[PDB]
Design an enzyme around this catalytic site. Structure first.
Site, PDB file in Angstrom:
ATOM      1  N   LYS A  45       0.828  -1.209   0.000  1.00  0.00           N
ATOM      2  CA  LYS A  45       0.000   0.000   0.000  1.00  0.00           C
ATOM      3  C   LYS A  45       0.846   1.235   0.000  1.00  0.00           C
ATOM      4  O   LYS A  45       0.315   2.329  -0.143  1.00  0.00           O
ATOM      5  CB  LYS A  45      -0.957   0.012   1.207  1.00  0.00           C
ATOM      6  CG  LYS A  45      -1.863  -1.224   1.302  1.00  0.00           C
ATOM      7  CD  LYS A  45      -2.688  -1.247   2.582  1.00  0.00           C
ATOM      8  CE  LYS A  45      -1.866  -1.636   3.810  1.00  0.00           C
ATOM      9  NZ  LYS A  45      -1.714  -3.111   3.931  1.00  0.00           N
ATOM     10  N   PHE A  86      13.234  -4.696   3.990  1.00  0.00           N
ATOM     11  CA  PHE A  86      14.269  -5.357   4.770  1.00  0.00           C
ATOM     12  C   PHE A  86      13.690  -6.162   5.934  1.00  0.00           C
ATOM     13  O   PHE A  86      13.911  -7.397   6.058  1.00  0.00           O
ATOM     14  CB  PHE A  86      15.245  -4.276   5.250  1.00  0.00           C
ATOM     15  CG  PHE A  86      16.129  -4.691   6.339  1.00  0.00           C
ATOM     16  CD1 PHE A  86      17.161  -5.561   6.095  1.00  0.00           C
ATOM     17  CD2 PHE A  86      15.967  -4.183   7.605  1.00  0.00           C
ATOM     18  CE1 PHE A  86      18.018  -5.953   7.104  1.00  0.00           C
ATOM     19  CE2 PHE A  86      16.823  -4.556   8.626  1.00  0.00           C
ATOM     20  CZ  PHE A  86      17.851  -5.436   8.373  1.00  0.00           C
ATOM     21  N   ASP A  91      11.542 -11.041   8.631  1.00  0.00           N
ATOM     22  CA  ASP A  91      10.326 -11.496   9.338  1.00  0.00           C
ATOM     23  C   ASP A  91       9.772 -12.749   8.713  1.00  0.00           C
ATOM     24  O   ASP A  91       9.558 -13.695   9.424  1.00  0.00           O
ATOM     25  CB  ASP A  91       9.220 -10.450   9.375  1.00  0.00           C
ATOM     26  CG  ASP A  91       8.057 -10.850  10.291  1.00  0.00           C
ATOM     27  OD1 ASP A  91       8.140 -10.594  11.506  1.00  0.00           O
ATOM     28  OD2 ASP A  91       7.033 -11.412   9.803  1.00  0.00           O
ATOM     29  N   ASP A  95       9.230 -16.451  10.623  1.00  0.00           N
ATOM     30  CA  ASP A  95       7.844 -16.824  10.780  1.00  0.00           C
ATOM     31  C   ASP A  95       7.434 -17.967   9.812  1.00  0.00           C
ATOM     32  O   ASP A  95       6.259 -18.324   9.733  1.00  0.00           O
ATOM     33  CB  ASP A  95       6.983 -15.547  10.584  1.00  0.00           C
ATOM     34  CG  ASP A  95       7.179 -14.513  11.729  1.00  0.00           C
ATOM     35  OD1 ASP A  95       7.930 -14.812  12.684  1.00  0.00           O
ATOM     36  OD2 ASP A  95       6.592 -13.406  11.699  1.00  0.00           O
ATOM     37  N   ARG A 100       3.959 -13.196   0.280  1.00  0.00           N
ATOM     38  CA  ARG A 100       3.759 -11.835   0.731  1.00  0.00           C
ATOM     39  C   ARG A 100       3.454 -10.900  -0.441  1.00  0.00           C
ATOM     40  O   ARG A 100       4.147 -10.938  -1.460  1.00  0.00           O
ATOM     41  CB  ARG A 100       5.001 -11.315   1.466  1.00  0.00           C
ATOM     42  CG  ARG A 100       4.902  -9.800   1.695  1.00  0.00           C
ATOM     43  CD  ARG A 100       5.796  -9.277   2.771  1.00  0.00           C
ATOM     44  NE  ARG A 100       5.746 -10.110   3.961  1.00  0.00           N
ATOM     45  CZ  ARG A 100       5.142  -9.817   5.112  1.00  0.00           C
ATOM     46  NH1 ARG A 100       4.497  -8.667   5.302  1.00  0.00           N
ATOM     47  NH2 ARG A 100       5.212 -10.707   6.111  1.00  0.00           N
ATOM     48  N   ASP A 162       8.851 -10.663  20.479  1.00  0.00           N
ATOM     49  CA  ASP A 162       7.895 -11.455  19.741  1.00  0.00           C
ATOM     50  C   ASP A 162       8.366 -12.901  19.564  1.00  0.00           C
ATOM     51  O   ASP A 162       7.599 -13.829  19.825  1.00  0.00           O
ATOM     52  CB  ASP A 162       7.706 -10.763  18.380  1.00  0.00           C
ATOM     53  CG  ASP A 162       6.738 -11.470  17.454  1.00  0.00           C
ATOM     54  OD1 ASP A 162       7.020 -12.629  17.049  1.00  0.00           O
ATOM     55  OD2 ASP A 162       5.728 -10.815  17.074  1.00  0.00           O
ATOM     56  N   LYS A 185       8.022  -3.159  17.841  1.00  0.00           N
ATOM     57  CA  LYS A 185       8.149  -3.780  16.507  1.00  0.00           C
ATOM     58  C   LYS A 185       7.373  -3.141  15.363  1.00  0.00           C
ATOM     59  O   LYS A 185       7.657  -3.411  14.211  1.00  0.00           O
ATOM     60  CB  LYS A 185       7.836  -5.279  16.527  1.00  0.00           C
ATOM     61  CG  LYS A 185       6.394  -5.664  16.452  1.00  0.00           C
ATOM     62  CD  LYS A 185       6.197  -7.088  16.007  1.00  0.00           C
ATOM     63  CE  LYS A 185       4.746  -7.435  16.306  1.00  0.00           C
ATOM     64  NZ  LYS A 185       4.173  -8.424  15.366  1.00  0.00           N
ATOM     65  N   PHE A 224      -3.029   0.056  14.611  1.00  0.00           N
ATOM     66  CA  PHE A 224      -2.667  -0.526  13.323  1.00  0.00           C
ATOM     67  C   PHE A 224      -2.353  -2.000  13.414  1.00  0.00           C
ATOM     68  O   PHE A 224      -2.802  -2.776  12.579  1.00  0.00           O
ATOM     69  CB  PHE A 224      -1.467   0.224  12.706  1.00  0.00           C
ATOM     70  CG  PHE A 224      -1.031  -0.336  11.386  1.00  0.00           C
ATOM     71  CD1 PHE A 224      -1.696  -0.009  10.237  1.00  0.00           C
ATOM     72  CD2 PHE A 224       0.021  -1.223  11.304  1.00  0.00           C
ATOM     73  CE1 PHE A 224      -1.327  -0.539   9.017  1.00  0.00           C
ATOM     74  CE2 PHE A 224       0.395  -1.769  10.075  1.00  0.00           C
ATOM     75  CZ  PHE A 224      -0.275  -1.406   8.923  1.00  0.00           C
ATOM     76  N   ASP A 228      -3.734  -5.630  11.964  1.00  0.00           N
ATOM     77  CA  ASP A 228      -2.894  -6.642  11.340  1.00  0.00           C
ATOM     78  C   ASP A 228      -3.156  -7.997  11.954  1.00  0.00           C
ATOM     79  O   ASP A 228      -3.244  -8.979  11.237  1.00  0.00           O
ATOM     80  CB  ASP A 228      -1.405  -6.343  11.459  1.00  0.00           C
ATOM     81  CG  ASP A 228      -0.535  -7.360  10.652  1.00  0.00           C
ATOM     82  OD1 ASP A 228      -0.761  -7.365   9.410  1.00  0.00           O
ATOM     83  OD2 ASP A 228       0.333  -8.150  11.232  1.00  0.00           O
ATOM     84  N   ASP A 229      -3.246  -8.068  13.277  1.00  0.00           N
ATOM     85  CA  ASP A 229      -3.512  -9.357  13.958  1.00  0.00           C
ATOM     86  C   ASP A 229      -4.861  -9.957  13.580  1.00  0.00           C
ATOM     87  O   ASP A 229      -4.964 -11.171  13.267  1.00  0.00           O
ATOM     88  CB  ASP A 229      -3.389  -9.200  15.465  1.00  0.00           C
ATOM     89  CG  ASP A 229      -1.916  -9.055  15.924  1.00  0.00           C
ATOM     90  OD1 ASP A 229      -1.024  -9.384  15.112  1.00  0.00           O
ATOM     91  OD2 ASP A 229      -1.639  -8.664  17.103  1.00  0.00           O
TER      92      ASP A 229
HETATM   93  C1  LIG Z   1       4.512  -6.120  12.210  1.00  0.00           C
HETATM   94  N1  LIG Z   1       5.834  -6.442  11.603  1.00  0.00           N
HETATM   95  C2  LIG Z   1       6.783  -5.672  12.231  1.00  0.00           C
HETATM   96  C3  LIG Z   1       8.107  -5.762  11.928  1.00  0.00           C
HETATM   97  C4  LIG Z   1       8.472  -6.662  10.977  1.00  0.00           C
HETATM   98  C5  LIG Z   1       7.520  -7.431  10.365  1.00  0.00           C
HETATM   99  C6  LIG Z   1       6.176  -7.363  10.655  1.00  0.00           C
HETATM  100  C7  LIG Z   1       5.409  -8.282   9.857  1.00  0.00           C
HETATM  101  C8  LIG Z   1       4.027  -8.606  10.360  1.00  0.00           C
HETATM  102  P1  LIG Z   1       3.228  -9.663   9.105  1.00  0.00           P
HETATM  103  O1  LIG Z   1       4.261 -10.900   8.902  1.00  0.00           O
HETATM  104  O2  LIG Z   1       1.865 -10.107   9.508  1.00  0.00           O
HETATM  105  O3  LIG Z   1       3.238  -8.759   7.752  1.00  0.00           O
HETATM  106  P2  LIG Z   1       4.191  -9.620  11.851  1.00  0.00           P
HETATM  107  O4  LIG Z   1       4.849 -11.014  11.218  1.00  0.00           O
HETATM  108  O5  LIG Z   1       2.804  -9.967  12.419  1.00  0.00           O
HETATM  109  O6  LIG Z   1       4.937  -9.021  12.912  1.00  0.00           O
HETATM  110  C1  LIG Z   2       3.830  -4.093  10.261  1.00  0.00           C
HETATM  111  C2  LIG Z   2       3.282  -4.969   9.427  1.00  0.00           C
HETATM  112  C3  LIG Z   2       1.879  -5.452   9.611  1.00  0.00           C
HETATM  113  C4  LIG Z   2       4.046  -5.497   8.248  1.00  0.00           C
HETATM  114  C5  LIG Z   2       3.278  -5.293   6.971  1.00  0.00           C
HETATM  115  O1  LIG Z   2       2.755  -3.955   6.916  1.00  0.00           O
HETATM  116  P1  LIG Z   2       1.727  -3.573   5.727  1.00  0.00           P
HETATM  117  O2  LIG Z   2       0.558  -4.517   5.969  1.00  0.00           O
HETATM  118  O3  LIG Z   2       1.584  -2.060   5.587  1.00  0.00           O
HETATM  119  O4  LIG Z   2       2.491  -4.118   4.394  1.00  0.00           O
HETATM  120  P2  LIG Z   2       2.545  -3.478   2.897  1.00  0.00           P
HETATM  121  O5  LIG Z   2       1.240  -2.721   2.688  1.00  0.00           O
HETATM  122  O6  LIG Z   2       3.773  -2.546   2.859  1.00  0.00           O
HETATM  123  O7  LIG Z   2       2.607  -4.774   2.091  1.00  0.00           O
HETATM  124 MG   LIG Z   3       4.700 -12.661  10.044  1.00  0.00          MG
HETATM  125 MG   LIG Z   4       0.892 -10.865  11.247  1.00  0.00          MG
HETATM  126 MG   LIG Z   5       6.410 -11.605  12.937  1.00  0.00          MG
END
Ligand SMILES: C[n+]1ccccc1CC(P(=O)(O)O)P(=O)(O)O
Ligand SMILES: C=C(C)CCOP(=O)(O)OP(=O)(O)O
Ligand SMILES: [Mg+2]
Ligand SMILES: [Mg+2]
Ligand SMILES: [Mg+2]
Ligand SMILES: C[n+]1ccccc1CC(P(=O)(O)O)P(=O)(O)O
Ligand SMILES: C=C(C)CCOP(=O)(O)OP(=O)(O)O
Ligand SMILES: [Mg+2]
Ligand SMILES: [Mg+2]
Ligand SMILES: [Mg+2]
Lengths: 338, 338
Positions: A45, A86, A91, A95, A100, A162, A185, A224, A228-229
């Site tokens: 986005k 990065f 991540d 994970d 992605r 985390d 984070k 935010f 995401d969660d």
């Molecule tokens: C929220 N976040 C913060 C720092 C680096 C990566 C991310 C990815 C998210 P995402 O993997 O859901 O996009 P997280 O795995 O829930 O923590």
């Molecule tokens: C902190 C988190 C949730 C990592 C992904 O963030 P976004 O969901 O904004 O990822 P992009 O829009 O940049 O793909």
């Molecule tokens: Mg993740």
């Molecule tokens: Mg997540």
């Molecule tokens: Mg993570």
């Protein structure tokens, strides 16, 4: 819109990176880095980038805005998006993600593998070249560098909290812990960092106004990340671009924090039995349980309760900071579904 | 002395905690103290020392105070931390089991791939240390740039090294490629960085001097890494602290490059069948071949020829660069066996 004016400058940043380093003498590598940045900046986005720009615009006096300084705000913005590339590249490794932004994760591709750790080092390097190139002779150089660096420290702290590891003792899954995980984070680099860049470019100095900004920024970033969660569990994969893995990896997400708050004694058993396993029987049972504990409805109430709360804290700010700016940042995310 | 360099480490570790947001997350502050202590322990401390020696021998003797020496030790420790970051990432990519007589960090059972996050921590530490001691000096911005350039060069080198032949095709295992790999992956941060840090601390800024230093530093680094390659095969794991993997990982090491100069047409077939396999008998066949082609003998001559050549150059340098310093540095690694 503002997104198309921001995506315009990508090839120019790609070029700045090459031309302003030792990549010129090793074009095998300068070409490999162009493929890495284009793949790991695609989809998405571009929210953090935009935020940086929007912040500059909204905070600077309109008569001091130049086309130069707008380019710089787009550049800073793009640094932040590289940072993001990065972080999520690493991540996804920690994970065990598989997709992605619609495509396979950079490390999953067959020609890459764990060679990805080094691609990340290239990406993170890029940022300081770009910064150096534009900003070395300006008084704000030091501040920019320090800020991107802090943002790595915070993000690393968060990530540690985390990914830190006994089988079925979910007694670290408290709200005190989740609030720290999401402060460090997500909040700092997602909102404090864009805004703070916007503030530096606008030559705003007051350490009291930075603090007031930080406080509001961090509140929004918690918000935010709760979204995401939610989306990990309940998002639609075609829209979101990614497969949700917090259940299988046993993460301290908002949903699990809330599940434990609400469980009866028998339900707690179900949860500490089936959470954290990759069997699909176990993952379905945990979603059946999230359904009975009425968590999708709590989410809806809480999204709105925090929404109102943020808007109220935003209207409380001095005008040098722009309430309009924060209001809009909040609206950009409120009710989102990817 | 080394043990006077190791005496300052507790005040560094201390500055990393108190000087950051870690003051608020004592869980993570402690974890970072374990990461640093484990990944700085053992090993020769040579790049740290080089930093100190370079300062002490390039500076004019009466400027050297109990303070600037503490500052030079501080900078050495920043380089040592950088070393720790790089080996921690190299060990993941190279599939190593042990370093410095103990398991690689990522091999530890509780850490695994979350080592990539600890590397980010360690890298962020470097700059809190620099901020704490140099924020209010004219050399600060340069110090910061040096470090970020060092990440770039090393990652480029690491890219050329990890980028994988395409079956039995060793047509890329040339000395032109070897030279490019080692100039970037080792020489910049092993010698060019520490020497430049000592130069910055001693107000040497003529860029023809910075150039001449650099031309000598890259030659010494080439040499150092050739010895490294020899050690992967022929070193004693108890002297050296690490297990050799170049053969198994099909690395473009000095030994393979040289073996391909010497192979007959049938020996090139033995080498292509067996190089790059984890099978213990295949690894032995390649060492059997390395013995047939007489590489140990080759090494000994080459080590000395190159040694002579470096010494010729060190004596060709201008007085302000201290040939003594370079002569010293060479003698510190000549004939090393770990
Ligand atoms: C929220 N976040 C913060 C720092 C680096 C990566 C991310 C990815 C998210 P995402 O993997 O859901 O996009 P997280 O795995 O829930 O923590
Ligand atoms: C902190 C988190 C949730 C990592 C992904 O963030 P976004 O969901 O904004 O990822 P992009 O829009 O940049 O793909
Ligand atoms: Mg993740
Ligand atoms: Mg997540
Ligand atoms: Mg993570
Ligand atoms: C030579 N080098 C340069 C940068 C980072 C790490 C190393 C480690 C060595 P080493 O693993 O033999 O200690 P390399 O993998 O053979 O290149
Ligand atoms: C560049 C290389 C070969 C990495 C290991 O360097 P050292 O041989 O200096 O290892 P330590 O002294 O730090 O253990
Ligand atoms: Mg290597
Ligand atoms: Mg290695
Ligand atoms: Mg080696």
């Amino acid at each position: 819109t503002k997104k198309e004016s921001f995506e315009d400058v990508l090839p120019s940043i790609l070029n700045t990176i090459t031309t302003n380093s030792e990549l010129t003498e090793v074009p095998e590598v300068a070409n490999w880095l162009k493929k890495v940045l284009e793949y790991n900046l695609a989809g998405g986005k571009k929210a953090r980038g935009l935020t940086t720009l929007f912040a500059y615009e909204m905070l600077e006096k309109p008569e001091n805005i130049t086309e130069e300084t707008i380019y710089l705000a787009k550049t800073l913005g793009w640094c932040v998006e590289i940072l993001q590339g990065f972080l999520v590249m690493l991540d996804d490794i920690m994970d065990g993600s598989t997709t992605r932004r619609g495509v396979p994760c950079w490390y999953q591709l067959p020609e890459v593998g764990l060679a990805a750790v080094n691609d990340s080092s290239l990406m993170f390097s890029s940022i300081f070249y770009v910064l150096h190139a534009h900003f070395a002779d300006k008084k704000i150089y030091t501040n920019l560098v320090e800020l991107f660096n802090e943002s790595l420290m915070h993000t690393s702290i968060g990530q540690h909290l985390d990914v830190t590891m006994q089988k079925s003792d979910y007694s670290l899954f408290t709200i005190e812990r989740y609030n720290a995980i999401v402060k460090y984070k997500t909040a700092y680099y997602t909102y404090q960092l864009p805004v703070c860049l916007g503030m530096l470019l606008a030559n705003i100095s007051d350490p009291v106004l930075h603090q007031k900004a930080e406080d509001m920024c961090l509140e929004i970033g918690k918000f935010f990340q709760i979204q995401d969660d939610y989306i990990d569990c309940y998002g639609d994969e075609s829209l979101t671009g990614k497969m949700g893995t917090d259940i299988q990896e046993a993460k301290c997400s908002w949903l699990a924090v809330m599940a434990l708050q609400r469980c009866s004694a028998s339900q707690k058993i179900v949860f500490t039995t089936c959470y954290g396993s990759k069997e699909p029987a176990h993952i379905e049972r945990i979603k059946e349980l999230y359904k009975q504990l009425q968590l999708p409805e709590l989410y809806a109430q809480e999204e709105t309760r925090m929404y109102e709360s943020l808007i109220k804290q935003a209207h409380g700010l001095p005008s040098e900071l722009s309430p309009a700016l924060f209001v809009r940042l909040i609206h950009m995310i409120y009710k989102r579904n990817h």
